Design a protein around this ligand. Structure first.
Ligand code: PA8
Ligand code: PA8
Ligand code: PA8
Ligand code: PA8
Ligand code: PA8
Ligand code: PA8
Ligand code: PA8
Ligand code: PA8
Ligand code: PA8
Ligand code: PA8
Ligand code: PA8
Ligand code: PA8
Ligand code: PA8
Ligand code: PA8
Lengths: 48, 48, 48, 48, 48, 48, 48, 48, 48, 48, 48, 48, 48, 48, 48, 48, 48, 48, 48, 48
């Protein structure tokens, strides 16, 4: 029931809102995505 | 008695006013929603 | 799945290492526990 | 390589050197482990 | 013919983009919806 | 019920007093008319 | 006296001037309302 | 269903963890308490 | 030699960079797209 | 029936009332014309 | 100008400000209390 | 193709309507001209 | 002499410093590039 | 009296506050416990 | 295997997202690249 | 038994071994003394 | 009575707490393990 | 000749002086080793 | 199989070799004695 | 296979040369002896 995390490699530009990062991360065969707090990076998550 | 919390997967845009976040969170099968103070993100809530 | 988060009420002192906060969260009928990055608060996580 | 990350559940104490974190992460069925640069936390990794 | 407008009753929060305001007005049995320039309210429009 | 609003397409000049604007709006098949507060435009109102 | 506060759940748009927010808050069975300083939210107030 | 909110009158110092603020708020005849995110104030909550 | 404008009805989220808004506007059978200045709305353009 | 918009290029002066802008826009082979809210520019509209 | 010092055994949480520690220390039948500078421990004091 | 922009060299005064700014830009051997949304600067455009 | 400017259509990520934006713009057949102040966009420039 | 010390073999994690180390040390049939200054080791003491 | 590290020679500016650093590092005959946490340097990696 | 602590008033010089510090503390109406770890200060102890 | 020591071949990383060093040394068919005071290495001891 | 770096995985304890770390690195098929400045980690180096 | 530790109260001077400190600790009703590493104090040990 | 080490209990005086310490160590049922580099203590070694 762990949540593994890695940075998106297909997300363009600044990560401001969640649905775009979640959509790109799901496209990368992950389950969810969210933005980082400081550098606005789109992080992909999936169970592991 | 204890409120659990997670970020909304469907809420678009910046979380400014509460009602739009509560509506998106209730649609996601939660009991309420609210914005984060700093990053302005829609956080869904439900009893743990 | 979705991960829900809430602050623990039994963890004493500052949260430095994860196992102690994880232990108190499992004691609080949760799945995992981790420390916050700035104020070092013990946060309990579990499926929503 | 692209690596998924999650914090070690079993690693005790401050993460200073890599081998102790790697040892706990491998025991948790992960490929490797490393210390976070700032907060000094043992993060487990596996290919993604 | 002429276009009559009135404030929406189901649109929550601040009117930023048009599709959300336009969708609520159609559910309110109007033909179109647009955001007010200043106060950012959802104005529903239909033929008079 | 709700009040639908549209500008007058027959009122000439500045909208200073109410009776002339109401009189023009009733001729335009509306129930009432009033002046806008800043630009002094004659506005016609009727039930939606 | 001690005043309790909550954000309005009926106020549409951004909060520029006080009277529109005060009106919505009073319809919500509060005694007054005012605009937040930065994000221009409508905050309702009433004695606790 | 409305959560009224006001700052605690008995909580001393800065609000870091929830239990100390919730404890002081219940002693003030409120149902819960939490820390403000930025100013770290202790805010008491009860149904309006 | 004039350009017709309308807001996108398929663009997701906030318009920061141009290429994403141009791509969504082309899918809506326009020729180009650009962001609004403040509210960051994706505006579609095409020859009138 | 999406509405495409462009600024008038024959309207002289400042757009206060709608009839002058609508008449100028129809002479420009558009279906309607309305004033902008702040700068009072005449804006022509027609189906996209 | 001497004070006998011992660590508090009732102070919960992090010791950032003086008031919370001094409050818990007086309840422990001491006269004052202050926080340690690094680990943020509550230290009670009383005249020797 | 791609459109490059630069502020006009000859346009006198504040840029409110488009036709005046378009004339000055064409006189400067550019294609079109438009106003900036904030400082109201006349911006000339031509293919990059 | 006169500097013509457009936004890059190839620059990936946040524009914090100049050299990364300058390198992308030269590949785009421009001569220089700089970052926007607020949203940190890469803007390419070249002589008109 | 004469006081002897030995490192605790049951205290988990980092020794921050005294009560956890004291409780673990008394569990080991000792009389008191405190933390070392630098490495934060839980040291158990008892009459020797 | 183990990963050797060295700072990229061709990476301009600071390292924000991974794909830019990975691309420059691969062109320098390395297998991967990532950003340093604090100084935001592009560090090229290859098996060792 | 709870132990109170303060630095000696009369201990001459740098605290290295225990007996000299204990002697000065017993003279100062305390029960025992010991050296601090870093600055090597003689610290007197007695029950609170 | 007499005791001989040697460096541990199994203990990884820095030697902070005694139990992990004793556990590795017992696994190396020694009777006890402890950390060297300075270089913080795990030393294995057994009857000599 | 560009040099590559990897943290040692056999060096015991903290890294105070170079020779002990350099010796462990050569046994790891590297050419040299040195201590990190703050956390005193043994870092192995060899030509890339 | 657990050694308790206390500083000698009879050994004079600095502790260089083991036999002298060991002898002084035997007279103090202890099993063994050894020097501290840096300050060269005589430490007496006996089973807990 | 492994060299176990302990301090000699028969060597008198300073340890300047190896042969004198080796002779005393061999007399103590050991294989070899050597001087410590700073304190000049005679240390006996033998297979573990
Ligand atoms: C200096 C006092 C304040 C504490 C600094 C803490 C640094 C920190 O939080 O690093 C993480 C942050 C990147 O965040 P993100 O990539 O997860 O969005 O950091 C960065 O992006 C790195 C740059 C940090 C600022 C420059 C170095 C001092
Ligand atoms: C002008 C300074 C005024 C005082 C600032 C101090 C406020 C404060 O305590 O912030 C801590 C907050 C929550 O911390 P934690 O519970 O996650 O450890 O964590 C954060 O604020 C970080 C999360 C937000 C990330 C975006 C920061 C730009
Ligand atoms: C020929 C000169 C034209 C400009 C001078 C008058 C400005 C103006 O048009 O204000 C009125 C207009 C809407 O008013 P109305 O059409 O409802 O009467 O728009 C507004 O109410 C704009 C409000 C401006 C303040 C915004 C910040 C709170
Ligand atoms: C000590 C006096 C107060 C200053 C420190 C407290 C920070 C603070 O009040 O943040 C401002 C703002 C709050 O919005 P509002 O709901 O109060 O209108 O919310 C935000 O900041 C939202 C995030 C974006 C940052 C501001 C952008 C303009
Ligand atoms: C006095 C200096 C002001 C400088 C900025 C001027 C305001 C401005 O240009 O607002 C643009 C925005 C329209 O959104 P957009 O679709 O054009 O991005 O319009 C609005 O958001 C209208 C409501 C603005 C309310 C502001 C309240 C503080
Ligand atoms: C250097 C600072 C300059 C600030 C004033 C900017 C003036 C300006 O361009 O306002 C016009 C803009 C849109 O007007 P319009 O083309 O719809 O008539 O209006 C809007 O976008 C709506 C908001 C206007 C009022 C803003 C009050 C904060
Ligand atoms: C590898 C293990 C890392 C452990 C990290 C935590 C150590 C630490 O914070 O020690 C604090 C201690 C006293 O702190 P306090 O309780 O007075 O706030 O220290 C001092 O007051 C002395 C200052 C530091 C002197 C020694 C430097 C290592
Ligand atoms: C190639 C660089 C382009 C600008 C980079 C980002 C900063 C910015 O937006 O400044 C300009 C902007 C005016 O917008 P516009 O009317 O020029 O489109 O903002 C203002 O008008 C505010 C600043 C100027 C007035 C300051 C008054 C204290
Ligand atoms: C604290 C936040 C201030 C900016 C609010 C709007 C946020 C936003 O998306 O601004 C983008 C826009 C263009 O800036 P840039 O992305 O080109 O650097 O920026 C502007 O046009 C800003 C103009 C501000 C003029 C103010 C004059 C009083
Ligand atoms: C480069 C500086 C080297 C300092 C260490 C050498 C001296 C040493 O180890 O002294 C023993 C001390 C034990 O402290 P404690 O057991 O009383 O908490 O342990 C420490 O003080 C260990 C601190 C080492 C921490 C280094 C960063 C991880
Ligand atoms: C920075 C200016 C010089 C140091 C001033 C003293 C700072 C201070 O109050 O440190 C006290 C603290 C605890 O020492 P002790 O009472 O446990 O021996 O920890 C220490 O004494 C650790 C610091 C030792 C190293 C001093 C600077 C080289
Ligand atoms: C003056 C102390 C704070 C600044 C230390 C120097 C800044 C720095 O390089 O931080 C990163 C550094 C990495 O250690 P190393 O692997 O390079 O030895 O080490 C750390 O991140 C460890 C932080 C040390 C303080 C820990 C809390 C007491
Ligand atoms: C930066 C990390 C390391 C800082 C010092 C850590 C504490 C430390 O090593 O204390 C023990 C040592 C003497 O101990 P001992 O010989 O009495 O057992 O030393 C002292 O008593 C400390 C006195 C200060 C001078 C130490 C010189 C090596
Ligand atoms: C205030 C007292 C300062 C130290 C004075 C005493 C030094 C001392 O006794 O050094 C020898 C001893 C180990 O010696 P030996 O048993 O290997 O011959 O211990 C050491 O080698 C410890 C070296 C000191 C720390 C060096 C920096 C980490």
């Amino acid at each position: 029931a762990r949540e593994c995390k890695t940075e998106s490699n297909t997300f363009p530009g600044i990560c401001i809102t969640k649905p775009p990062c979640r959509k790109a991360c799901i496209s990368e065969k992950f389950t969810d995505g969210h933005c980082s707090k400081i550098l606005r990076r789109c992080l992909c998550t999936k169970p592991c």
